[PDB]
Design a protein around this ligand. Structure first.
Ligand code: CU
Ligand code: CU
Length: 475
């Protein structure tokens, strides 16, 4: 049969300078089986909210679920009051209005729930949206810009399904250790869709929307990807890559050539991550089928995209240390449950070093920062407003992958997991890899966050966040 077309999220702009988002339960079909799913302005996933830098907009958010949620704008530099972390509770049948005064460069950001201890479940049920920030600078470049034709959002997510076809989500000792992962890959909510792309340049806005699964994009015929933007917006010039690793909650925009009429796949390559490396993710896995077409397409790859500032001198900067840890009992219990469920396949992708690390009680608070499981009532510290700080985040002592995310900022990576960052990760980021080594970011918070609307800093492996690997901080 024909592959289904890639679903394109609606590009939603202001009215009275207002935007309406409805959070609701409905139904979706996956592999011919119906499931209860949640969506923003529909059944599953959500729209792309389109924002202009320097232009205020009001968002009216209606919770039509039968349980509490929050709405977090991932990668937006906004005050804590509108950040929608776990303190931004919207009750069932409630409404919250937020004024977003956008004051950052053009970027692809996203939005999702941040309900305390339930973020994994609420994203797994289908809640995620996009944010497209535009500025004068990006619109001058003549990048591909026809939304849903040559400028395409690609939200990649895995799920697992029970026998009846319902989403099979559980926060248990296995998923608290290694994450919630599945055997079914979704692309804008569809299984292995096709996208009809005009000949010339195709812009893909890639979002890893998975709870726990790291991805590594490539093409089926090894044509290159040209990275043009990271989480926080444009690189100074394009970076040519043959593969593109993307952690949970990271975005990159890439241009790819649609040259001849022969279709090719966007794929994800096997990653060395425990549980994630298991079949069917032990071989290259198709993400979507690009079908070349002949219709209007004038987008270009510019030699120069933007100016990236020199890093400042680090002397005098406040240093914060964040030591990530997991109770040895959770590693043991969680690993034991993984090995019970997958047997001989359980150590897929793992080298000798990775396995010897695993040497051979309430799990809801077993994941920690600085020896502390997340305490919603006790911000770990008071950060300075408008001042560079150096944040040193360590996974030394721990075997697992931790995409570390900091609210309220776009930062510069100084060191990523004991190496300088790759060229395409050296610009504006809101996520940094921590995996058995130490990362160092240069962060600045331009907006206030008081105690009662604190910013979060957490692992974006959502089951780790939900079982304690989060801290609140004031600005
Ligand atoms: Cu965030
Ligand atoms: Cu983690």
């Amino acid at each position: 049969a024909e592959r289904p077309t890639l679903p394109i999220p609606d590009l939603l702009t202001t009215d009275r300078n207002r935007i309406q988002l409805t959070i609701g339960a409905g139904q979706s079909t996956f592999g011919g089986k119906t499931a209860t799913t949640w969506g923003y302005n529909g059944n599953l996933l959500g729209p792309a909210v389109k924002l202009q830098r320097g232009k205020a907009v009001t968002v009216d958010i209606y919770n039509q679920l039968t349980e509490e949620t929050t709405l977090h704008w991932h990668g937006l530099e906004v005050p804590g009051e509108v950040d929608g972390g776990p303190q931004g509770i919207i009750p069932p049948g409630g409404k919250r209005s937020v004024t977003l005064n956008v004051d950052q460069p053009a970027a692809t950001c996203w939005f999702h729930p941040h309900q305390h201890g339930k973020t994994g479940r609420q994203v797994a049920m289908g809640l995620a949206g996009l944010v497209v920030i535009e500025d004068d600078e990006i619109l001058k470049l003549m990048l591909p810009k026809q939304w849903g034709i040559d400028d395409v959002p690609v939200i990649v997510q895995d799920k697992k399904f029970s026998a009846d076809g319902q989403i099979d989500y559980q926060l248990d000792v296995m998923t608290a250790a290694v994450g919630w992962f599945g055997d079914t890959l979704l692309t804008n909510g569809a299984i292995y869709p096709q996208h009809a792309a005009p000949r010339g340049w195709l812009r893909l806005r890639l979002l890893n929307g998975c709870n726990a699964r790291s991805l590594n994009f490539a093409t089926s015929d090894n044509r290159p990807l040209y990275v043009i933007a990271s989480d926080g917006g444009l690189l100074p010039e394009p970076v040519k890559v043959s593969e593109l690793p993307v952690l949970m909650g990271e975005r990159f925009e890439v241009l790819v050539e649609v040259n001849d009429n022969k279709p090719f796949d966007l794929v994800t390559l096997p990653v060395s991550q425990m549980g994630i490396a298991i079949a069917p993710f032990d071989k290259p896995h198709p993400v979507m089928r690009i079908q070349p077409i002949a219709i209007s397409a004038s987008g270009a790859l510019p030699d120069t995209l933007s100016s990236l500032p020199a890093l400042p001198s680090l002397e005098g900067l406040t240093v914060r240390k964040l030591q990530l840890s997991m109770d040895p009992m959770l590693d043991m219990m969680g690993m034991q449950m993984l090995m019970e469920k997958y047997g001989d396949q359980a150590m897929a992708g793992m080298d000798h070093s990775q396995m010897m690390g695993h040497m051979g009680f309430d799990f809801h608070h077993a994941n920690k920062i600085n020896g502390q499981a997340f305490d919603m009532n006790k911000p770990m510290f008071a950060a300075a407003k408008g001042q560079y700080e150096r944040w040193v985040i360590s996974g030394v002592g721990d075997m697992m992958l931790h995409p570390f995310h900091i609210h309220g900022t776009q930062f510069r990576i100084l060191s990523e997991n004991g190496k300088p960052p790759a060229a395409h990760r050296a610009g504006w980021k809101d996520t940094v890899k921590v995996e058995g080594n130490v990362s160092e970011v240069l962060v600045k918070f331009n907006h206030d966050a008081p105690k009662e609307h604190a910013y979060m800093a957490h692992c974006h492996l959502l089951e780790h966040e939900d079982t304690g690997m989060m801290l609140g901080f004031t600005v």
